[PDB]
């Protein structure tokens, strides 16, 4: 039995936009390996699955936080009691989604990675989910989220800057997320700007020496760095 039926189902889940189910499908593939690693196709699907499941909660959290602020500032105390209870239900889901993909990165995807690209990808992804904890967690939990994000992004960068070109979308993607961590979570606009510019310039420097479909892949991310650089200046 090769259940790459589980891969096909995840692809249908994706088409259907039923992302919780896309997660289950790609989780079944993941928890089914012995010594083998997720292919590129498979890890991307897993990551897209989780980005969409977490993304709906993050989008909901943002709108409920705005409404909370707007209402606290009109003294509507009764609204605020309600909005806050709603915000904490979203925070449980955020908290559980992050735990699921963190357990699977700590337990499985990270210890068993082989190539560089893989290691960076998964260490990057661990940083990503500690970052999402830090967007809404409060005290000790926020400090622990922020520390875990810095360690994972840094472990990913040491491996990236050795074992991958400056144009490799995974190296750019790390720089883009790490730049954002510095701006949104640590509140270092300088560190963020410098990190994005450095990885952009370093990628232009060695750009027109890759197959026409590579250019597509990483022009995409490089436009994301430039978009943020514009927004911040």
């Amino acid at each position: 039995m090769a259940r790459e039926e589980n891969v096909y189902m995840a692809k249908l889940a994706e088409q259907a936009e039923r992302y919780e189910e896309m997660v289950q499908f790609m989780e079944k593939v993941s928890t089914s390996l012995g010594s083998e690693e997720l292919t590129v196709e498979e890890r991307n699907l897993l990551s897209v699955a989780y980005k969409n499941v977490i993304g709906a909660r993050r989008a909901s959290w943002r709108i409920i936080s705005s409404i909370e602020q707007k209402e606290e500032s009109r003294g509507n105390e009764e609204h605020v009691k309600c909005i806050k209870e709603y915000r904490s239900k979203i925070e449980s889901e955020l908290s559980n989604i992050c735990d699921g993909i963190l357990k699977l990165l700590d337990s499985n995807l990270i210890p068993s990675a082989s190539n560089g690209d893989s290691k960076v990808f998964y260490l990057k992804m661990k940083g990503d989910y500690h970052r999402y904890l830090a967007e809404f967690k409060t005290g000790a939990e926020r400090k622990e989220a922020a520390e875990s994000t810095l360690s994972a992004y840094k472990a990913a960068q040491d491996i990236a800057n050795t074992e991958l070109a400056p144009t490799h979308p995974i190296r750019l993607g790390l720089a883009l997320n790490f730049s954002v961590f510095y701006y949104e979570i640590l509140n270092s606009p300088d560190r963020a700007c410098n990190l994005a510019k450095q990885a952009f310039d370093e990628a232009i420097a060695e750009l027109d020496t890759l197959g026409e479909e590579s250019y597509k892949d990483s022009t995409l991310i490089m436009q994301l760095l430039r978009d943020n650089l514009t927004l911040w200046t």
Binding site: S47, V48, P169, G173, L220, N228
Partner: peptide, 7 residues
């Protein structure tokens, strides 16, 4: 809006 990676 600020952006992050697609993966």
């Amino acid at each position: 809006r600020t952006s992050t990676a697609p993966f």
